[PDB]
């Protein structure tokens with residue numbers, strides 16, 4: 130159909146910052162994660178490199194996407210597809226060419242795909258403060274992020290869902306640990322310590338001629354992948370403004386629906402979640418100034434100059450949101 | 456028999472309590488009766504308005520979720536750690552250092568710190584792709600699980616012994632209990648001991664001679680090492696208790712190696728009953744783990760723990776002279 134023809138040409142932009150991820154979401158019938166991951170796996174030749182049967186991959190992605198809540202405005206399968214594709218671009222960057230093995234690449238993309246699976250649309254602090262089953266299970270520590278990992282790995286055990294079946298013993302173990310360290314690092318309560326170590330690595334960065342980056346142990350491979358997926362998760366303000374604003378509308382609706390769930394239980398309303406005292410534009414400027422821009426500036430230095438366009442878009446969008454404040 | 460149990464329970468403030476007799480005399484309820492006795496002794500039911508029937512009901516529910524078919528990590532071990540932590544809290548070097556809430560957290564954490572232990576290591580649960588290691592992403596799999604169970608059972612019928620604590624009290628106790636139990640993971644032992652060595656070398660005492668602890672970081676860290684010491688307190692106990700603990704942990708290890716054999720996996724250290732020496736295990740366990748830990752704790756509370764440290768070294772030299 131012309132229906133599938135357009136999705137296929139929209140998917141040609143899969144290597145580009147600013148992929149039309151919302152139209153891909155509509156064209157695929159609300160399967161952006163499955164089609165974007167399939168494309169990225171086709172693009173990186175990962176099915177052959179790891180002997181993943183395509184119907185096993187599709188079956189897993191469909192199951193994985195099924196476990197993102199479609200009634201959650203932001204932390205849904207579109208956000209996962211976006212973080213997947215954003216990590217996929219951040220991996221093709223010139224300063225990181227052939228720095229990561231086929232396995233580590235598989236870790237970064239897989240972690241991005243599962244990094245928010247089964248997100249209920251409420252924050253860790255909410256889950257802790259409501260004495261939820263999730264916070265009880267995980268002892269208030271990275272509650273969501275531990276749950277995303279647990280579901281993402283668990284779904285591999287469903288019928289014809291083990292996309293890692295033809296990986297070796299040690300490969301499965303190394304992939305498992307890397308995905309764990311990556312997704313656990315998406316917890317915003319670790320952002321400051323994560324950013325400090327990224328600065329420390331930047332202060333002492335070592336590069337070849339041409340500008341490819343040198344890491345040596347594992348404690349530096351994983352932290353770059355940690356900050357990369359952390360950057361991809363915090364990449365909305367660096368996307369074209371029309372994309373950024375649709376993400377802003379979605380995160381605010383999800384915040385507000387948490388604030389209503391909070392107000393109806395008579396709880397303290399978390400920052401950003403009260404629709405009756407919100408300042409969406411000022412909040413985006415502060416969020417950029419204090420969180421997103423320090424992160425992406427530090428990432429830009431580490432990969433100089435490959436992330437300049439990304440950083441440029443972020444500062445354009447900051448200046449714009451500031452101008453919407455009268 | 457209730458008269459004899461009550462008399463053994465008079466030793467609740469003593470190192471070397473006959474915890475195994477109390478297990479027998481209480482109908483395999485050492486955790487319930489020892490916790491109840493300690494709560495009475497410390498007057499915790501009235502301090503925190505804990506109703507007596509609620510306490511007994513939770514304690515027996517908690518004790519039930521320890522496995523009676525696990526040789527070491529069972530309700531007797533929990534009662535032992537509870538009572539050992541109880542004695543360590545009463546040491547003169549810590550008089551009036553800790554609040555009633557921190558005392559409640561340390562004792563409660565000791566009670567739940569190994570609940571629903573299946574008798575196999577974290578590494579075994581990771582290598583066998585267990586549902587527990589799956590749930591907890593291979594990090595402190597048992598310890599996170601003990602915490603989840605211990606807090607979960609407070610929700611059963613008339614089991615919330617914290618129902619009359621204030622909300623911030625509950626919030627403060629919950630965080631302290633989590634920090635304490637997660638520190639019982641032996642993978643955390645070296646860092647926990649390095650911190651304790653740092654605290655000993657930078658030690659501060661008030662006007663009295665009592666340990667000085669400004670902040671949460673130092674206070675929770677002492678409680679972590681305290682419960683960690685109580686958890687690793689078998690070789691410091693009188694030899695007839697120590698040996699029974701050693702027989703139990705060896706049998707639990709051997710059972711883990713028997714399942715490792717029924718799967719062709721590499722057999723964990725000290726789990727191969729066909730290549731195990733109990734005497735060498737105890738000597739290495741004391742020399743590398745228990746004596747470094749207890750010597751450092753003895754420094755922190757010097758000289759309060761001299762008899763405990765003397766008993767550990769005597770039990771060391773009992774192995775030395777008999778191997």
Ligand SMILES: O=c1cc(-c2ccc(O)c(-c3c(O)cc(O)c4c(=O)cc(-c5ccc(O)cc5)oc34)c2)oc2cc(O)cc(O)c12
Pocket residue numbers: 317380400401411412413414415416419420
């Ligand atoms: O230290 C800070 C941490 C955070 C922080 C912490 C957890 C957080 O979860 C998010 C978060 C996030 O994880 C994801 C987001 O999309 C936002 C967002 O859009 C807006 C904000 C926001 C804006 C203004 C505020 O006063 C507070 C929050 O937060 C988002 C941000 O936001 C700041 C916003 C500021 O304006 C100033 C700060 O110092 C901070």
Ligand SMILES: O=c1cc(-c2ccc(O)c(-c3c(O)cc(O)c4c(=O)cc(-c5ccc(O)cc5)oc34)c2)oc2cc(O)cc(O)c12
Pocket residue numbers: 641689700701704724725736737739740741743744
């Ligand atoms: O890293 C280590 C962890 C542990 C460890 C872990 C879980 C554990 O459960 C116990 C444990 C415990 O909790 C209680 C015990 O009574 C013992 C014991 O008697 C003997 C041993 C033991 C002895 C030698 C070994 O090579 C291993 C174990 O362990 C007991 C100990 O023991 C060590 C003992 C050593 O001699 C050296 C170590 O590095 C370690």
Ligand SMILES: [Mg+2]
Pocket residue numbers: 244245273315316
């Ligand atoms: Mg997340």
Ligand SMILES: [Mg+2]
Pocket residue numbers: 568569597639640
């Ligand atoms: Mg334990």
Ligand SMILES: [Zn+2]
Pocket residue numbers: 208212244245315362
């Ligand atoms: Zn996310």
Ligand SMILES: [Zn+2]
Pocket residue numbers: 532536568569639686
């Ligand atoms: Zn224990």
